[PDB]
RNA sequence: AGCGCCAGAGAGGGUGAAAGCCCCGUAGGCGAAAGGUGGGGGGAUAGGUGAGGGUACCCGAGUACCCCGUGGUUCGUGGAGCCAUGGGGGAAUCUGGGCGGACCACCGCCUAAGGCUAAGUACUCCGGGUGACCGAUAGCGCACCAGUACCGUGAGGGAAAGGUGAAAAGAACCCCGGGAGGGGAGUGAAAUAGAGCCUGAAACCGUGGGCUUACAAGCAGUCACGGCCCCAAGGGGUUGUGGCGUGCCUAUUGAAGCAUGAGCCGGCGACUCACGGUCGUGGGCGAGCUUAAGCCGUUGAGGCGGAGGCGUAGGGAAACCGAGUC
RNA sequence: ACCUGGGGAACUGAAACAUCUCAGUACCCAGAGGAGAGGAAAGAGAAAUCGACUCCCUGAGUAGCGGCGAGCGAAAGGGGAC
């Protein structure tokens, strides 16, 4: 094209600000002349006033952290069929992850807005209302014995 | 839209001409081009800038002035950073440049790199090479008639490393394995020429 | 590097889905208070305004 | 090592600057300092040297150095860069197309 | 400036200034009697090579195991195992013994109390190559006879100092002078290049010249007229009166302030980078977007690489449900 | 310099400080070598599973640990090197 003129377009701006000048920021520096703004500060977000924070908020968290760690247990990845009947044919996992959603996310269970069509679709779980909604032209394809 | 190469005779057929869409002449986006010349550039930055800190220093730490009486300034070890013989404070230290330019982009810049230069009439696919051994000569002989007399630069890339030697010596051209067309050559240069080999890699590389 | 997450505060707030900052409410915490008054039913979960902007910035991993 | 030059104790021609183009016999090579020597700069002295044994001096001193590199070997012709020839067992030096 | 030429060689350095073709080199291609090294490709030793049926002989001891005291692990006494182990007690040999987070019971994993084992990994005294690395107050503490001089009993601390010229041609001889230094002479392109010698800034000390001052009171200047000195309907330099005028910085409610700092000059001298994050913004792509490490090329070519990571649904402590949920 | 073992601080942080932190860091000592260490399962952990060890990228600032403070922080599994 031209070695000249290929540069940023109206935004580079790669020119910081300087607070060593005489004009602008100086002396004190891009805002300052105090102290405790002199080389840190202790926060601020949760410290400081040396008062209580808002740790005063008790931890309803609950039911959290035992010991060995988080319990191995089966999770199960949400898709609505508003996604779904993006495409026909046979829908399935796998056939989802390669693309969408999922992605080993695990257990596949549908549900949903939209109205998907009739086109047996394999999963893990589906709503009162996914089943019925589909109900109407689908699949019933299910759970696992091995 | 606009996409009309220019075939190089093999022998005693004529210049057919090819063509490819947005691959050709069609929205060339300043802007990105350089971005891709920016990340081309400094990845390539051979980041070796050191400079000693304060303790970095060879000094011993002992405390030069006993700081209480004796009027002279205060101080710590003639390590101090505004002690002339000192460590500098905030020098360049050892580091790296590089970042992950888009894949998505990296490409679409060859694109307007190979595009502009088309569009401007100066991409020609080549064929024809009667330079063997790697002959300066004949290679020279070859350009005359293929039309390069050397007033403008030349990026030659083509599978044939022959070639390559052939020209690998002229202070007018820029001879590159086609594996390694990149945007910043490309416009580094004034004409690119190419074999048609090398456009078709350069092609799967995006069709 | 990598800023860790601050527990406590992941502890005791779960932030919703557009931007709030949600918490239990002081007071009732198993009374301690004592003796009721009708005042321990009102206590379910609330909005901390304007100091959750920093609350917030405490999670920024585990989001 | 690689200290090695061109001429040697034989026929050279200047192509320096003062003298550029003069040519006249061996140089009586230096080479750690990369100095000829030739017929070129001939320059004078005020010659009795660290001890005036023998009366004084004179003033018709002798050759300057001169550095090595504005020298040149030469032979039917002008300047011309050495080349080697094999001989099918020993070696020599020959002129571009003239030989010795 | 005019005609050429080589190029697998238009890297670089050097030659009195800016050379592809002058010199050393560069691309490319050859070389080892000798001594190291060397499965990359091949030879040879060492050593290793099956399946059923029976006893019920072996399968690592102050060990396991339990208890007291501790250490390691994300684990800080916790519901606290496992792996280590100082103290006490103290087994069994496959109907054996350990582990899967107290403890049982199931289910399954593994064989403790003997040992060796390449590679991929780490580092940089040492050799080489590059640098949007420094260029003598920098870069190593040392570009130089530096871990020196000097300092300290000692451990230890720890400097300064680089550049004549292309070439010594480095100033014969005469003169002044005890010498040193100079004046001529002479070399050189240049000697205000003459030797701790390129360029040579500022502070600071001088000589000469111009204007100006010994009745007048000042942050030293500014405004205005007038006079004197170098070019002319203008300008410079100086300044005799007149008018007006409390330094700079810092810190302060408030400084000329009798509050801090500064002798003067010249150098050195302070908002950085890495990784996370959050807004804004310039771009690519969009229900999608994107790669890490590494492999392949390059030798200042970039490719490949989907493990993974954001995003597509939220509620609820959780089970769980779901455009809902609590 | 790097490595393994045996010993092993405080300043600081917690806006005081004693648990905790800095940190098994600084340092001291022994030893190893072009590396050292580790290494062929009395392993891992939920997978009809895996199959010495070491190194890198992830996993993950997750699981957890913690005057549940400040703050500390894995492993399996998945990519690679070998």
Redesign the interface.
């Known amino acids: ?3 000249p003129n ?4 109206k935004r580079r701006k790669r020119v910081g600000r300087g607070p060593g000048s005489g004009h602008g920021k100086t002396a004190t520096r891009g805002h300052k002349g105090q102290k405790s703004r002199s080389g840190g500060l202790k926060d ?3 410290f400081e006033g040396g008062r209580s924070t ?8 609950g039911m ?1 952290g035992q010991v060995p760690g988080e319990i191995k247990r089966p999770r199960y990845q949400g898709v609505n069929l508003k996604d779904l009947a993006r495409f026909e044919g046979e829908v399935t996992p796998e056939l989802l992850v390669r693309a969408g959603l999922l992605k080993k996310g695990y257990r596949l269970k549908i549900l949903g807005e939209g109205e998907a069509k009739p086109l047996k679709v394999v999963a893990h779980a589906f709503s009162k209302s996914a089943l019925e909604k589909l109900k109407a032209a689908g699949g019933e394809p299910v759970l696992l014995e091995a | 839209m606009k996409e009309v190469a220019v075939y190089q005779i093999p022998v005693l057929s004529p210049s057919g001409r090819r063509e490819l869409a947005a691959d050709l002449p069609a929205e ?1 986006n ?2 990105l ?2 971005e891709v ?1 920016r990340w081309q550039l400094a990845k390539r930055r051979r980041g070796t800038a050191s400079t000693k800190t304060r303790g970095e220093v060879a000094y011993s730490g002992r405390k030069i002035w006993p700081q209480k009486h004796t009027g002279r300034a205060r101080h710590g070890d003639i390590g101090a950073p505004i002690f002339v013989g000192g460590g500098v404070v905030f020098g360049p230290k050892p580091r790296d440049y590089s970042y992950t330019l888009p894949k998505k982009v990296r490409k679409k810049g060859l694109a ?1 790199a190979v595009a ?2 088309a569009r401007e009439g100066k991409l020609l696919l080549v064929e024809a090479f009667a330079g063997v051994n790697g002959k300066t000569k004949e290679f020279l002989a070859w350009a005359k008639e293929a039309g390069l007399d050397g007033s403008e630069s030349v990026l030659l890339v083509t599978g044939n490393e022959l070639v390559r030697r052939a020209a690998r010596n002229l202070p007018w051209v820029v001879t590159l394995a086609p594996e390694g067309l990149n945007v910043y050559d490309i ?2 240069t004034e004409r690119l020429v190419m074999d048609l080999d090398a456009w078709e890699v350069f092609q799967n590389r995006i069709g | 590097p990598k800023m860790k997450t ?1 527990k ?7 932030i919703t889905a557009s931007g709030k900052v949600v ?2 409410k ?1 007071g009732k ?1 198993h009374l301690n208070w004592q003796k009721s008054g009708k005042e321990i039913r009102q206590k379910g ?1 609330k909005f ?1 305004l304007a ?1 959750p902007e ?2 917030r ?2 999670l920024l991993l585990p989001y | 090592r690689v200290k090695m030059h061109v001429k040697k104790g034989d026929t050279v021609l200047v192509a320096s600057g003062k003298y550029k183009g003069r040519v006249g016999k061996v140089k009586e090579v230096l080479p750690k300092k990369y100095a000829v020597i030739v017929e070129g700069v001939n320059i004078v002295k005020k010659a009795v040297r660290v001890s005036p044994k023998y009366p004084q001096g004179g003033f018709i001193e002798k050759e300057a150095p001169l550095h090595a590199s504005k020298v040149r070997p030469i032979c039917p012709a002008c300047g011309k860069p050495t080349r080697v020839r094999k001989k099918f067992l020993e070696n020599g030096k020959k002129i571009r197309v003239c030989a010795k």
């Open positions: 094209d031209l070695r290929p540069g940023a377009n601020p977000r949760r808002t740790l005063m908020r008790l931890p309803k968290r959290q | 060339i300043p802007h081009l350089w010349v307007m502009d230069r416009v580094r | 601050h406590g505060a992941k502890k005791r707030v779960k918490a239990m002081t915490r979960r901390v100091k920093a609350e910035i405490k």
